[PDB]
Amino acid sequence: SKKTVEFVDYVNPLMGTESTFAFSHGNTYPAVAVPWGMNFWSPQTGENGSGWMYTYTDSLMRGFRQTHQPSPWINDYGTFSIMPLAGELKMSHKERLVPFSHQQEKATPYNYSVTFNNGLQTSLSATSRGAVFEVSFPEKEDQYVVVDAYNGGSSITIEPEKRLVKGATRYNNGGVPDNFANYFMMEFSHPVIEYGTYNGDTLLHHQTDVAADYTCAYLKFDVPAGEKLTIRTASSFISPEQAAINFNREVADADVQLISGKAREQWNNYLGRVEAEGGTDEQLRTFYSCLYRTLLFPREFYEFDSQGNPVYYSPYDGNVHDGYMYTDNGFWDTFRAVHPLFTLLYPEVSERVTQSIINAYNESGFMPEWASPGHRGCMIGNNSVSLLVDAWMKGIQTVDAEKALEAMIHQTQARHAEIASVGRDGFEYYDKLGYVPYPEVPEATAKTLEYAYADWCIARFAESLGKQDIADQYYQKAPNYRNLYYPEHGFMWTKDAKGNWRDRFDATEWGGPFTEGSSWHWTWSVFHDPEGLSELMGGHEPMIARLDSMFVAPNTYNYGTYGFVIHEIAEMVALNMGQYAHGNQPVQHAIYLYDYIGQPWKTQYHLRNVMDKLYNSGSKGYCGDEDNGQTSAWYVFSAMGFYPVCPGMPEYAIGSPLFKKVTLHLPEGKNFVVSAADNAADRPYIRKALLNGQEFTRNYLTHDELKQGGELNLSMDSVPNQQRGTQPADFPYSYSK
Amino acid sequence: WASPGHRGCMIGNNSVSLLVDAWMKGIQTVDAEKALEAMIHQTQARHAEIASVGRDGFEYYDKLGYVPYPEVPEATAKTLEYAYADWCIARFAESLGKQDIADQYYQKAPNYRNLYYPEHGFMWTKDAKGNWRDRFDATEWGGPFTEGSSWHWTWSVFHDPEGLSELMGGHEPMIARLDSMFVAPNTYNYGTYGFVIHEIAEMVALNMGQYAHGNQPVQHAIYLYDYIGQPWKTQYHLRNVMDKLYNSGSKGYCGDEDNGQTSAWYVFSAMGFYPVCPGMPEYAIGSPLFKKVTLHLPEGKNFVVSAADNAADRPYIRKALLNGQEFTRNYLTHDELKQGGELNLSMDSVPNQQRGTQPADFPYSYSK
Ligand code: NA
Ligand code: NA
């Protein structure tokens, strides 16, 4: 039903725009899009070529980009920009610098609007594959639009009499076939009075066709006072003909108001699949902003042909195929919570994503791990397997079982000749030794830990097909994490190919056999077997103590006499020293581990503390020094009250919900409610629970329990209930249990 | 190091810098041939007992392009100091018309590149066989470094900021790394309960020591934004440092005064400009502390830096006139000062991101 404040109204696309470390994979741009849209749009302040496309502290705008960028370091491909200008014409991105104030900027998912200091106003709204702009030019100043087709070998053609511009952009950062291009077209509402092209060296007036390394074109207008210029645009990865089909289907005849309303409706539809009630405006903004961020990637990479059928340009083999393709995703990051969120609330997406993984395998020989748009060398692991198996175990079964199994096994028994992250780096050593050795293989221990998990997923998959021999082969590798636990030191470490432990153990030392972390983080990377990890650590007791040594309260000695303001200044210190590296991948699940070892109240306390202290909805809203936006799905799940600790096992460990109520609108008209009528900032603890009206003491919900609809009714309290959730029957899955 | 005669202390051949910086500014009171002989000898010889007199490890340096560790103590710091002295000698020889000698020394000016560890993005160390020392650690003091770690010493390339940015991946990455050194502290959501809790938080960041003010190899670092397109950041951060890291009381400095050096940084920075690279007669512009400074130079010439609307929260240069003409360069030459005149600055509470961002505006780099 219509509401005064709709879910999309809570979204701030600039949340955490100042929260990201320069040398991380976190994006900072206010994406204008529809969910999973093939093309995104954004303001651009950075130079062409810079992954730092939009920098909040920069006050000069250069263009509005059609972008696909999933990380500043992965960078962009198939990108061009459009830039309206008043007064003086400037062609090169190096010279198009127009001052604006954030006070005259309004960024939302369905429309970005900005008014420059010179009074020129523009806004744009996106469809899946196109966009529409309005431009209001200042009176009595020259009126231009510049189209920038980027460098790397581009072309632009102007047809002034038809008010059309078409072109091809080929800029990319690798991972593309030899015939790669994005074919674009745009239409202007008003007569093109003058026009010209630029080839990176010379501005050529009256010329209408240009091709060079770097190309731009300008159009000059004479829009009458009171009127606005509309620009309609769409692109395709298939051909100029398909770009025109996309244009005609999605943006032809539209003004920005039409596209804006449609995108707003789409966002409200998709965001509204989880309805949060009974929270502050700040909490609602944080939640829906994180959810918006979560519904952007991976992007759909398919298009609908003249017959309305889905087709795609393959970024793996460069041919056009029937069916579905997605891209722009690092599974090493997104298997943990983003794809699990899809399997629950957006399973129609997982249905197509899983098919696309197999398609990429058919087209290239390997499943992707980091793709943008094709195979890119980045990060580690075989988490492609997790997406397939997690979905399969939740009843999302669109791929052929035998083909999927073959692909999974191959991913663990081969590696790309050039790209270490494609397939399994070090598989020969791992199969022989039970671990990947360092310094023989970079990041060996983090790899071993990721591989033991992927092998557990493959065992689970094979077992569910009745292929018990293959399952037992893979279950034999599931405990390989144990092979790197250094008993004298009580942490994961590394060995060379001869079995010698690396000299001078140091739990805090980054790099080497570890990835983006140290043993302090990577020791927790055993989410398929928390019970087996506790065994290594000497039992539930020692494990609880080590978790406690990550989330411990600040020490204020006798200084708290100055007030409660003392414990706040004191809490900063632990976070700044980084005892808990919120966002660090191998410990994203760690707060939930208390659910497995008998003290769920600690999960409840710490989770609620993190949600309150490390998030807000503003420009620095991903507060964790180690959080560069990657915890968006983590926040959505955690606010709802539960989290997929081990994808591939259809279970969600229970934390503590943020709102008085969330309602999940699931397939086939089923609704699942988590109600917490007496929830409050100082009432993080679950005293009692009813599941569908029956006393409920388990520390997890199954996917089936959610999917069938119903209600988890929680009685929240300010003190923990130490008699609840402490029995072995209450604990979620472990391989060794 | 002299007190009163030769004393074994510290490193480098910066005697050469005193001679060359003065010479290139027109101070020429020594025999040119004798000075060149002495400079060359300083790089080709070492005192039998005192490591800091002459060039410790010169044999290795000339052969390998760097001083190796553990063969020579403090090898990486020495290499970086030597690359700069060699650049100075090249400048001197060139000005005398000795182009061959100049070219031989200019070939050594880029030796700083030989210790940049690409995998890690910091200066590090190699042994004589060319093997990187195991267990890289950017914050590890001692060994191949002195009075600092790679974190500090990575910035010790005053004769070639452009070439340093090249190693780092360009202007933007170098900006990003400077920004992290000078970043204001993270206050999470604690900003609500109190304030300036941000001020208190700043003191913690300084206790931690992200930017080691006074630490020699990074003294110039705040001025580097002048070389890479964002002078407004130099302006903001310099003024912050001058306000927060100095006072006139008994605990007035953040570290050793050092024979006028920490003191001289403050004097230059308060006047509005700083000699990033002695031996090159120019001064990178920062942001003046006062509404006016007048320098009384030789031959009755006076140079004025005026900033009539200067104030504590107006650290930025909106606009400048040099001797009445629009001025956008991020440096003044020694000749511009010496001849007398005025740099008239319009100060502002917000940065002017359109000013001083062009290649023509950047000061000297050997690589440019
Ligand atoms: Na952050
Ligand atoms: Na705004």
Short mmCIF file of N, CA and C in Angstrom, two decimals, chain A residues 22-23 50 52 57-60 97 99 493 502-504 509 568 571-572 575-576 612-616 623 625, chain B residues 135-136 168 172-174 176-177 180 185-191 193 197 201 204 230 232-233 351 353-354 358:
data_model
loop_
_atom_site.label_atom_id
_atom_site.label_comp_id
_atom_site.label_asym_id
_atom_site.label_seq_id
_atom_site.Cartn_x
_atom_site.Cartn_y
_atom_site.Cartn_z
N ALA A 22 41.43 4.11 0.53
CA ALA A 22 41.83 4.31 -0.86
C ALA A 22 42.29 3.00 -1.50
N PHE A 23 43.04 2.22 -0.74
CA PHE A 23 43.64 1.01 -1.31
C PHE A 23 42.84 -0.22 -0.93
N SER A 50 40.61 6.97 -13.83
CA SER A 50 40.79 6.78 -12.41
C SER A 50 39.65 5.94 -11.81
N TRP A 52 38.81 6.08 -8.92
CA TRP A 52 38.17 6.97 -7.95
C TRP A 52 37.29 7.97 -8.72
N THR A 57 34.88 14.67 -1.50
CA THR A 57 35.54 15.93 -1.14
C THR A 57 35.94 16.78 -2.37
N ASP A 58 35.78 16.24 -3.58
CA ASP A 58 36.12 17.02 -4.77
C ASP A 58 34.89 17.80 -5.22
N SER A 59 35.09 19.04 -5.65
CA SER A 59 33.97 19.93 -5.90
C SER A 59 33.83 20.34 -7.37
N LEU A 60 34.49 19.60 -8.26
CA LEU A 60 34.48 19.91 -9.68
C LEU A 60 33.99 18.68 -10.43
N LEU A 97 35.72 20.79 -16.04
CA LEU A 97 35.73 20.82 -14.59
C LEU A 97 34.75 21.89 -14.18
N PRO A 99 32.36 23.58 -11.24
CA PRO A 99 32.16 23.60 -9.79
C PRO A 99 30.69 23.42 -9.38
N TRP A 493 48.98 -21.12 11.00
CA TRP A 493 50.28 -20.60 10.55
C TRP A 493 50.54 -21.20 9.17
N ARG A 502 56.94 -22.06 9.26
CA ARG A 502 57.67 -20.81 9.04
C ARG A 502 58.25 -20.31 10.37
N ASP A 503 59.46 -19.77 10.33
CA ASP A 503 60.14 -19.28 11.53
C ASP A 503 59.36 -18.14 12.19
N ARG A 504 59.57 -17.97 13.49
CA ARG A 504 59.17 -16.76 14.22
C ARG A 504 57.68 -16.47 14.15
N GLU A 509 51.04 -10.72 12.29
CA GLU A 509 51.77 -10.38 11.07
C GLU A 509 50.94 -10.58 9.79
N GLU A 568 33.01 5.79 26.46
CA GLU A 568 32.86 6.05 25.02
C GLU A 568 34.21 6.37 24.38
N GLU A 571 36.20 3.27 24.27
CA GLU A 571 35.80 2.23 23.33
C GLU A 571 36.42 2.46 21.95
N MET A 572 36.60 3.73 21.61
CA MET A 572 37.31 4.11 20.39
C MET A 572 38.66 3.41 20.28
N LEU A 575 38.82 -0.15 18.94
CA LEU A 575 38.46 -0.15 17.52
C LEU A 575 39.61 0.39 16.67
N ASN A 576 40.24 1.46 17.14
CA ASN A 576 41.38 2.06 16.46
C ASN A 576 42.62 1.17 16.46
N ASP A 612 25.02 -0.77 16.41
CA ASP A 612 24.86 0.59 16.94
C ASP A 612 26.11 1.43 16.74
N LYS A 613 27.29 0.83 16.90
CA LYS A 613 28.52 1.64 16.98
C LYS A 613 29.32 1.78 15.69
N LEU A 614 29.18 0.84 14.76
CA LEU A 614 30.01 0.84 13.56
C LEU A 614 29.27 1.21 12.27
N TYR A 615 28.04 1.71 12.41
CA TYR A 615 27.23 2.07 11.24
C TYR A 615 26.49 3.37 11.44
N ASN A 616 26.39 4.13 10.36
CA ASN A 616 25.36 5.16 10.26
C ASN A 616 25.02 5.37 8.79
N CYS A 623 31.68 2.66 9.38
CA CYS A 623 32.68 3.23 10.30
C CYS A 623 33.92 2.38 10.52
N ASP A 625 37.28 0.68 10.38
CA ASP A 625 38.49 0.94 9.59
C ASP A 625 38.67 -0.11 8.50
N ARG B 135 60.66 -11.01 5.36
CA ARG B 135 59.72 -10.46 6.33
C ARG B 135 59.58 -8.95 6.27
N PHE B 136 59.21 -8.42 5.11
CA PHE B 136 58.95 -7.00 4.98
C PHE B 136 58.04 -6.47 6.09
N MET B 168 54.95 4.99 -6.95
CA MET B 168 53.72 4.77 -6.18
C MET B 168 52.48 4.52 -7.05
N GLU B 172 47.62 10.45 -8.11
CA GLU B 172 46.48 10.10 -7.26
C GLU B 172 46.81 9.14 -6.12
N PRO B 173 47.53 8.05 -6.41
CA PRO B 173 47.95 7.19 -5.33
C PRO B 173 48.84 7.91 -4.31
N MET B 174 49.76 8.76 -4.77
CA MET B 174 50.59 9.49 -3.81
C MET B 174 49.74 10.41 -2.93
N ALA B 176 46.64 9.85 -2.12
CA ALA B 176 45.94 8.94 -1.21
C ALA B 176 46.80 8.57 0.00
N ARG B 177 48.08 8.30 -0.24
CA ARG B 177 49.01 7.93 0.83
C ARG B 177 49.36 9.09 1.77
N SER B 180 46.38 9.59 4.03
CA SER B 180 46.30 8.63 5.13
C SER B 180 47.26 9.01 6.26
N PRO B 185 41.27 11.66 12.89
CA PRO B 185 40.98 10.36 13.48
C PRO B 185 39.53 9.93 13.29
N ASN B 186 39.31 8.62 13.31
CA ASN B 186 37.98 8.06 13.20
C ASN B 186 37.25 8.11 14.54
N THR B 187 36.10 8.77 14.56
CA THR B 187 35.32 8.90 15.80
C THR B 187 34.02 8.09 15.79
N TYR B 188 33.83 7.28 14.75
CA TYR B 188 32.67 6.40 14.63
C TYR B 188 31.37 7.18 14.85
N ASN B 189 30.53 6.75 15.79
CA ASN B 189 29.32 7.51 16.13
C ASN B 189 29.44 8.35 17.41
N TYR B 190 30.64 8.47 17.95
CA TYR B 190 30.85 9.15 19.23
C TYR B 190 30.76 10.67 19.12
N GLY B 191 30.70 11.18 17.89
CA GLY B 191 30.55 12.62 17.64
C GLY B 191 29.34 13.24 18.32
N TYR B 193 27.68 12.26 21.31
CA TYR B 193 27.97 12.44 22.74
C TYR B 193 29.24 13.25 22.98
N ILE B 197 34.96 15.99 20.64
CA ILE B 197 35.48 14.68 20.92
C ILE B 197 36.44 14.37 19.78
N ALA B 201 40.17 12.98 20.10
CA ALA B 201 40.51 11.86 19.24
C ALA B 201 41.78 12.15 18.44
N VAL B 204 44.93 11.19 20.36
CA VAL B 204 45.16 9.75 20.30
C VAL B 204 45.93 9.36 19.03
N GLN B 230 47.27 19.22 -5.83
CA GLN B 230 46.30 19.60 -4.79
C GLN B 230 46.88 20.47 -3.68
N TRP B 232 45.77 22.84 -2.04
CA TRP B 232 44.87 23.19 -0.93
C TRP B 232 45.07 22.24 0.25
N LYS B 233 45.51 21.02 -0.04
CA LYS B 233 45.76 20.07 1.03
C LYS B 233 47.04 20.44 1.77
N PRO B 351 38.62 25.44 0.24
CA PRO B 351 39.70 25.32 -0.75
C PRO B 351 39.27 25.84 -2.12
N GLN B 353 39.73 24.55 -5.50
CA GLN B 353 40.23 23.38 -6.20
C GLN B 353 40.56 23.62 -7.67
N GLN B 354 40.32 24.84 -8.16
CA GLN B 354 40.67 25.21 -9.54
C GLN B 354 42.06 25.87 -9.63
N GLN B 358 47.78 22.70 -12.41
CA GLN B 358 48.35 22.42 -13.73
C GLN B 358 49.85 22.13 -13.66
#
